[PDB]
Amino acid sequence: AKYMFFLSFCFYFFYNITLTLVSYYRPREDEDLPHPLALTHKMSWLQLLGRMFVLIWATCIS
Amino acid sequence: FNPKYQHEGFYFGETPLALAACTNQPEIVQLLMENEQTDITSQDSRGNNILHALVTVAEDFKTQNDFVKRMYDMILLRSGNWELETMRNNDGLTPLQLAAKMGKAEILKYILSREIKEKPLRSLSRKFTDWAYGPVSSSLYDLTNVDTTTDNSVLEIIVYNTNIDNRHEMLTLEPLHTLLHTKWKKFAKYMFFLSFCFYFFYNITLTLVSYYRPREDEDLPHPLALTHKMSWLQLLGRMFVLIWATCISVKEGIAIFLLRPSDLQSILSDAWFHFVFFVQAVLVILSVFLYLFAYKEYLACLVLAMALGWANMLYYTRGFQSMGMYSVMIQKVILHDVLKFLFVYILFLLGFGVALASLIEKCSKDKKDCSSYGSFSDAVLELFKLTIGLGDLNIQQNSTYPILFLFLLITYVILTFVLLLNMLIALMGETVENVSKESERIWRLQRARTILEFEKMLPEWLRSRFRMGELCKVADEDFRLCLRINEVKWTEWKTHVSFLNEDPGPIRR
Amino acid sequence: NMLYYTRGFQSMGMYSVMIQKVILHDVLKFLFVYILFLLGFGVALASLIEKCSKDKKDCSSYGSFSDAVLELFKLTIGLGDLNIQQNSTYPILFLFLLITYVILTFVLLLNMLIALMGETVENV
Amino acid sequence: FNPKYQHEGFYFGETPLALAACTNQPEIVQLLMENEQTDITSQDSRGNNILHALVTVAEDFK
Ligand code: NA
Ligand code: NA
């Protein structure tokens, strides 16, 4: 339970960072379109790794 | 005899004579001492006699009936000579050493006195009464393996040893206390002041050569200046500073080559000074490589050693009576009490900081937001200027609620101005009054860290004597084992039998 | 020295001795530490920014090493002006290096004196 | 009677009547008070009687 507690902190402190980081990928660039969802149009990776992480780790924690 | 005594752990010394005394069985010990076949001298797999393993279990005074002191007294006063007591086992040390190295507090009080009132075996005592002349007795401890005159004595092993939580009570004992008081008195007070005199004058000359208006150009002047200019005192600094950076690096560079407990349990006694003295000396002599091809960090790296040359200047406070007591009431605090602050204050710094930044960050926030620098990290830097009394207040809005946001700033104010600042105050209401009436003992250790260091620094013939040589204890032939003198006090009078001289105070004639 | 005639009122002079035992050897444990960090961190923060036209036309205006020392004590008390610039070193990193001086003598050396009075004055 | 009592220091008042009482020996004091030859008035090198030097050593209650 020392180990199972550390991973619960590891999965959660890494959760709060990815919440903060998707609000600061300079994510305005427009009037106000960008939700950090971004499953729709753009080119590259790592814009999709957050929402499969954050929405699920908000789902299971609820 | 397995360590981690949860794994059973009963090193009593593996002989039937030993656990007779180790199990507090007094009548069976006298039963064993009557047989001619009984040996005491015989050693162990570790090489131990009955005296070694009897030292290894006392642990306390509370969880002990004070019998281990008695069984030590029973085993020598029934039989034994100094060959039974000066035996070294597999590790090379006296059983007197082992009471210090294992850290037994209570038994080492008894080894140093061990007064013998009876007549036939008064030779093996470690304490004598010279003269009485009323209630003013004069103490005399034996001091044959105790002071640093031989290799690996008890005083060297009581200071340079970790893994003992009971060191600061140990040096209160009488052959250690007044002797270490004496050795600081006659020269180590003077040798400490000159180490501060040579070092506080060092930090000034570091600072002064940076402010002989030494720019006058684009940026040429290193304070080396051994090349062209006219007059004196531009050269007296570099022959001083570079040498007193050289010798202070070699001295600490070998003094770091002794310590295996580098940082585990080495909170403040050895880590934070012999490291920092070495790092400050490295960064000063690093400027020689910076003057080689004029690397652009020639000054910014140099000025870091300046303040950290004044930061480790705090070490020489240890040696003034209560000034070092203040120096240990901070040094026990500055590691693990701002740690309880900084691992909480940052957790609210970036905590509330993300909410206050994104609420106002949409548009031309403040002072023409087209070229002026400002971001998330700007509101973080404005947040700490809110804590300290800088407190500027130029603040605007785009599409959210302005004075409601200014009220949401107050949510951060109510923590860490009345709450997290002051739980640290409430933490010091209990911790420092535990350090007070106990800092007197643990700072005395930090004095002892220096005194034996000056002993190792001076390999002369030691004209400074610090003992009384060849004074007789008692024999008809043995007039040896150089000695010590202290004084004692009042009541429980008795008819003082064993004296040594015709009641003098000073020397006769 | 008008404070001397406080001795003679019942507990007012009791306050007058709980300061007079303190004002000699308890600011001494402060001032022989606070100055040792005042000039201590003060030499690092001055030379890092002192190369060029630092602030407000550096051709005739008075300002030197001792200016950054006087700005340092105005940082302790709530005066706290913040006009600050750079030439060739790291600006906001230097402003973060100012905070290194802040964490002492606002939460630490101010409050060890409080922890000193938690034991000394209840002895007085 | 040297100051700095580490240097032995036993100013009991240098008379045989004095250290009878200074050494907490009560029966020997009454033994000395019976003799007609016993003087109490006689002073010292410092000029002290039995009462002076008896004051000089109490130091405490503990
Ligand atoms: Na305050
Ligand atoms: Na308090």
PDB file of C-alpha atoms in Angstrom, chain B residues 101-189:
ATOM      1  CA  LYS B 101      31.380   3.222  19.212  1.00  0.00           C
ATOM      2  CA  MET B 102      28.155   1.371  19.918  1.00  0.00           C
ATOM      3  CA  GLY B 103      27.075   4.428  21.887  1.00  0.00           C
ATOM      4  CA  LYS B 104      26.173   2.981  25.271  1.00  0.00           C
ATOM      5  CA  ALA B 105      25.515   5.955  27.515  1.00  0.00           C
ATOM      6  CA  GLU B 106      25.074   4.472  30.966  1.00  0.00           C
ATOM      7  CA  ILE B 107      27.913   1.979  31.036  1.00  0.00           C
ATOM      8  CA  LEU B 108      30.549   4.476  29.893  1.00  0.00           C
ATOM      9  CA  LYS B 109      29.815   6.620  32.929  1.00  0.00           C
ATOM     10  CA  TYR B 110      30.884   3.670  35.058  1.00  0.00           C
ATOM     11  CA  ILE B 111      34.057   2.775  33.146  1.00  0.00           C
ATOM     12  CA  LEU B 112      35.516   6.242  33.586  1.00  0.00           C
ATOM     13  CA  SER B 113      35.065   6.435  37.348  1.00  0.00           C
ATOM     14  CA  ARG B 114      35.120   2.788  38.585  1.00  0.00           C
ATOM     15  CA  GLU B 115      36.429   3.807  42.003  1.00  0.00           C
ATOM     16  CA  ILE B 116      37.969   1.089  44.160  1.00  0.00           C
ATOM     17  CA  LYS B 117      37.536   1.612  47.890  1.00  0.00           C
ATOM     18  CA  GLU B 118      39.207  -1.639  48.910  1.00  0.00           C
ATOM     19  CA  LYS B 119      42.935  -2.102  49.402  1.00  0.00           C
ATOM     20  CA  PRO B 120      44.265  -5.081  47.339  1.00  0.00           C
ATOM     21  CA  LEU B 121      43.047  -4.127  43.845  1.00  0.00           C
ATOM     22  CA  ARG B 122      43.021  -0.333  43.899  1.00  0.00           C
ATOM     23  CA  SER B 123      45.402  -0.376  40.921  1.00  0.00           C
ATOM     24  CA  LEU B 124      42.690  -1.120  38.369  1.00  0.00           C
ATOM     25  CA  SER B 125      40.563   1.909  39.202  1.00  0.00           C
ATOM     26  CA  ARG B 126      40.095   4.789  36.787  1.00  0.00           C
ATOM     27  CA  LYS B 127      39.615   7.459  39.473  1.00  0.00           C
ATOM     28  CA  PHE B 128      41.609   8.504  42.521  1.00  0.00           C
ATOM     29  CA  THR B 129      41.308  10.900  45.428  1.00  0.00           C
ATOM     30  CA  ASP B 130      44.493  12.896  45.935  1.00  0.00           C
ATOM     31  CA  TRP B 131      43.552  14.675  49.161  1.00  0.00           C
ATOM     32  CA  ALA B 132      40.422  15.540  51.106  1.00  0.00           C
ATOM     33  CA  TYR B 133      41.048  18.243  53.797  1.00  0.00           C
ATOM     34  CA  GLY B 134      37.303  18.569  54.339  1.00  0.00           C
ATOM     35  CA  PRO B 135      34.510  18.565  51.767  1.00  0.00           C
ATOM     36  CA  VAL B 136      36.742  19.820  48.953  1.00  0.00           C
ATOM     37  CA  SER B 137      38.101  16.790  47.119  1.00  0.00           C
ATOM     38  CA  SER B 138      40.331  16.875  44.051  1.00  0.00           C
ATOM     39  CA  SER B 139      39.428  14.585  41.158  1.00  0.00           C
ATOM     40  CA  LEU B 140      41.879  12.545  39.105  1.00  0.00           C
ATOM     41  CA  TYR B 141      40.861  10.411  36.122  1.00  0.00           C
ATOM     42  CA  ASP B 142      43.212   7.917  34.545  1.00  0.00           C
ATOM     43  CA  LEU B 143      43.330   9.117  30.893  1.00  0.00           C
ATOM     44  CA  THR B 144      45.262   6.329  29.221  1.00  0.00           C
ATOM     45  CA  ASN B 145      43.077   5.655  26.176  1.00  0.00           C
ATOM     46  CA  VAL B 146      40.807   8.679  26.319  1.00  0.00           C
ATOM     47  CA  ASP B 147      42.558  11.727  24.889  1.00  0.00           C
ATOM     48  CA  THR B 148      43.804  11.975  21.313  1.00  0.00           C
ATOM     49  CA  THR B 149      47.412  11.037  21.876  1.00  0.00           C
ATOM     50  CA  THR B 150      47.190   7.527  20.373  1.00  0.00           C
ATOM     51  CA  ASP B 151      45.377   6.076  17.372  1.00  0.00           C
ATOM     52  CA  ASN B 152      41.559   5.741  17.506  1.00  0.00           C
ATOM     53  CA  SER B 153      40.770   6.828  21.045  1.00  0.00           C
ATOM     54  CA  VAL B 154      37.331   7.362  22.545  1.00  0.00           C
ATOM     55  CA  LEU B 155      37.282  11.106  21.909  1.00  0.00           C
ATOM     56  CA  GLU B 156      38.035  10.664  18.213  1.00  0.00           C
ATOM     57  CA  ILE B 157      35.364   7.967  17.935  1.00  0.00           C
ATOM     58  CA  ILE B 158      32.732   9.885  19.914  1.00  0.00           C
ATOM     59  CA  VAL B 159      32.861  12.906  17.598  1.00  0.00           C
ATOM     60  CA  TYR B 160      33.507  11.432  14.151  1.00  0.00           C
ATOM     61  CA  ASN B 161      30.763   8.800  14.430  1.00  0.00           C
ATOM     62  CA  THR B 162      27.246   8.929  13.042  1.00  0.00           C
ATOM     63  CA  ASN B 163      24.473   6.390  13.807  1.00  0.00           C
ATOM     64  CA  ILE B 164      24.311   7.412  17.488  1.00  0.00           C
ATOM     65  CA  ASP B 165      21.446   9.589  18.682  1.00  0.00           C
ATOM     66  CA  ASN B 166      23.011   9.940  22.128  1.00  0.00           C
ATOM     67  CA  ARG B 167      26.250  11.821  21.431  1.00  0.00           C
ATOM     68  CA  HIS B 168      25.285  15.187  22.913  1.00  0.00           C
ATOM     69  CA  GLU B 169      24.672  13.593  26.307  1.00  0.00           C
ATOM     70  CA  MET B 170      27.933  11.623  26.183  1.00  0.00           C
ATOM     71  CA  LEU B 171      30.320  14.590  26.287  1.00  0.00           C
ATOM     72  CA  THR B 172      28.842  15.758  29.596  1.00  0.00           C
ATOM     73  CA  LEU B 173      30.859  13.009  31.313  1.00  0.00           C
ATOM     74  CA  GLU B 174      33.748  14.190  33.420  1.00  0.00           C
ATOM     75  CA  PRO B 175      37.017  12.926  31.792  1.00  0.00           C
ATOM     76  CA  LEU B 176      35.657  14.154  28.476  1.00  0.00           C
ATOM     77  CA  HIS B 177      33.956  17.397  29.511  1.00  0.00           C
ATOM     78  CA  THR B 178      36.589  19.379  31.384  1.00  0.00           C
ATOM     79  CA  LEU B 179      39.395  18.044  29.196  1.00  0.00           C
ATOM     80  CA  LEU B 180      37.722  19.258  26.015  1.00  0.00           C
ATOM     81  CA  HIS B 181      37.048  22.480  27.906  1.00  0.00           C
ATOM     82  CA  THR B 182      40.762  22.672  28.723  1.00  0.00           C
ATOM     83  CA  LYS B 183      42.040  21.927  25.226  1.00  0.00           C
ATOM     84  CA  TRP B 184      39.866  24.682  23.818  1.00  0.00           C
ATOM     85  CA  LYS B 185      40.995  27.012  26.593  1.00  0.00           C
ATOM     86  CA  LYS B 186      44.749  27.049  26.191  1.00  0.00           C
ATOM     87  CA  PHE B 187      45.153  27.139  22.411  1.00  0.00           C
ATOM     88  CA  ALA B 188      42.069  26.166  20.382  1.00  0.00           C
ATOM     89  CA  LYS B 189      40.317  29.390  21.323  1.00  0.00           C
TER      90      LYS B 189
END
